[PDB]
Amino acid sequence: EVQLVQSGAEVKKPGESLKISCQAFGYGFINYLIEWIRQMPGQGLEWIGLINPGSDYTNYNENFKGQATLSADKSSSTAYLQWSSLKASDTAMYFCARRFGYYGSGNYFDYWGQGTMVTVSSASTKGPSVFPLAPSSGGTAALGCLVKDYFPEPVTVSWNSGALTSGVHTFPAVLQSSGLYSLSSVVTVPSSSLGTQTYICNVNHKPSNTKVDKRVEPK
């Protein structure tokens, strides 16, 4: 087995620069061909570049020469991606990968790092506000929580401390014009249970150390 481990998720402002790492665990780093590929959420794959740590060889996507610098330290088997003058539209999941060997080698690999999430935005770390989506009018009822105005991603949401998962839908976040994120989490339950069962949503936004439990009651 070979494995690629990338550095942690980055949050930057427009105009700033980043440097993300991709560490290799294997024999013969110097004959690797390491690629970098990014993916905006919901979007396609964009090829950035390829590097051969054992030579001077880099190949770049012309659209990114000027922002992107590929490099590698042979002593630590780590490859690097530098990106200057970040733009909001550079927000993406960034992967390193080892897919090929030299042409003619017969080699085909499928080694991908776990990806490094890069968020480029002019906004500042902020915990969410949690508002209830209350049920109303022996069939089935719906209820939820609104998780509003937080930054950056992600947030996690559970119901009754994880004891409820059936009928739960936790929607993907949407970026508001404020630069803050907003999502709902909902759940459908029998309307006969509305007087008996307590419903609490557990919203956890690590980046700001916010942890909130909101009780969701009728009326």
Binding site: G44, G104, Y108, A142, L146, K148, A173, S184, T188
Partner: protein, 218 residues
């Protein structure tokens, strides 16, 4: 840059049926060395792509033989002889003949099921939110199929635009339905000077558009 064009963009499949994904390159993928470096990947949500097939027709280790690849020059096809639930996700063609390496935009493969109408629910803003200075009205379309759904907001019968946002869940693994939330966002001020807030839903499983309303303050 060698442009790679995938069709169809979206492919609903019924477990048991054969599927077919097409990739066209804007220029020949035959290398000067004679080989054709066209590869197929499958990416499941929140995961990275996995190699399925390399150089047109070769199965990557571990990949079952119900997957086959074919084609030549500029024209390539991925076939699944009998689809399964596990085959769901986004398929990308990838070329490594010419620099810069390029990818097609993806074909989404989803499970095809019988038409299911949404259950629609509407939630007025909370008292708690109103104290904050803002009003978010939320419309929920629940466990429906297929994805094509029209949600329109009506405030005192005036059609709204540009003040709502939608998001949609991934296809549910056990029932194959989608769910959707539409959020109308207003200022407390703009909110309070209207009475009827209405969510109107159009979808293939509804004989006619369904509205869910509240008159502010109940």
């Amino acid at each position: 840059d060698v442009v790679m064009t995938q069709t169809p963009l979206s492919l609903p499949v019924t477990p048991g049926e054969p599927a077919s994904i097409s990739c066209t390159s804007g220029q020949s993928l035959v290398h000067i060395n004679g080989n054709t470096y066209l590869h197929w990947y499958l990416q499941k949500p929140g995961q990275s792509p996995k190699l399925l097939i390399y150089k047109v027709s070769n199965l990557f280790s571990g990949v079952p033989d119900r997957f086959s690849g074919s084609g030549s020059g500029t024209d390539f096809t991925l076939k699944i002889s009998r689809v399964e639930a596990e085959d769901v996700g986004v398929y990308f063609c990838s070329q490594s003949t010419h620099f810069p390496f390029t990818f097609g935009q993806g074909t989404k493969l989803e499970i095809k099921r019988t038409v299911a109408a949404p259950s629609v629910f509407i939630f007025p803003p909370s008292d708690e939110q109103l104290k904050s200075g803002t009003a978010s009205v939320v419309c929920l379309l629940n466990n429906f199929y297929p994805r094509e759904a029209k949600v329109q907001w009506k405030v005192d019968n005036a059609l709204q635009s540009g003040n709502s946002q939608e998001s949609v869940t991934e296809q549910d693994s056990k029932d194959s339905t989608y769910s959707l939330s539409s959020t109308l966002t207003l200022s407390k001020a703009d909110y309070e000077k209207h009475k009827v807030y209405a969510c109107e839903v159009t979808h293939q499983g509804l004989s006619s558009p369904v509205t869910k309303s509240f008159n502010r303050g109940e």
